[PDB]
Design a protein around this ligand. Structure first.
Ligand SMILES: Oc1nc(S)nnc1Cc1ccc2c(c1)OCO2
Length: 133
């Protein structure tokens, strides 16, 4: 019942500062414009110890499966090749991506009927709010 309250199908309903987050990560102009338009659905499921997070949008479809605390390789929607580790910290999924000597952290939490995603690169935060689909 690890992650029960995250499981389901979620749709993006608001975003703030995502362009600035993407700039801080190193995303180029054209990818930022097309990625910033997307309204992804996030689909989260759990089978035993394996958590799967899918993102489906008109920009890119992605899928990661992982065990908490166990590093994995991830190709992000913006085409970075990163090494990722996801843990649970006080009920928050904390996802750290490392590449090219850089690091970004993505936190996913349940707040009321929302799933809130906070993306941080250095001093820049983007907040992306999802509701049940
Ligand atoms: O649109 C998205 N929304 C959520 S919450 N997560 N991933 C995505 C997909 C995505 C697009 C562009 C990006 C990125 C990730 O990282 C830097 O540039």
């Amino acid at each position: 019942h690890m992650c029960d309250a995250f499981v389901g199908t979620w749709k993006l309903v608001s975003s703030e500062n995502f362009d600035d987050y993407m700039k801080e990560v190193g995303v180029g102009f054209a990818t930022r414009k097309v990625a910033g338009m997307a309204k992804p659905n996030m689909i989260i499921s759990v089978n035993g110890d394996v958590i799967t997070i899918k993102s489906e949008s008109t920009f890119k479809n992605t899928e990661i499966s992982f065990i908490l605390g166990q590093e994995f390789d991830e190709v992000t929607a913006d085409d970075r090749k990163v090494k990722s580790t996801i843990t649970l910290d006080g009920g928050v999924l904390v996802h750290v991506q490392k590449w090219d000597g850089k690091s970004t952290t993505i936190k996913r939490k349940r707040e009321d009927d929302k799933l809130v995603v906070e993306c941080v690169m250095k001093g820049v935060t983007s907040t992306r709010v999802y509701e049940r689909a």
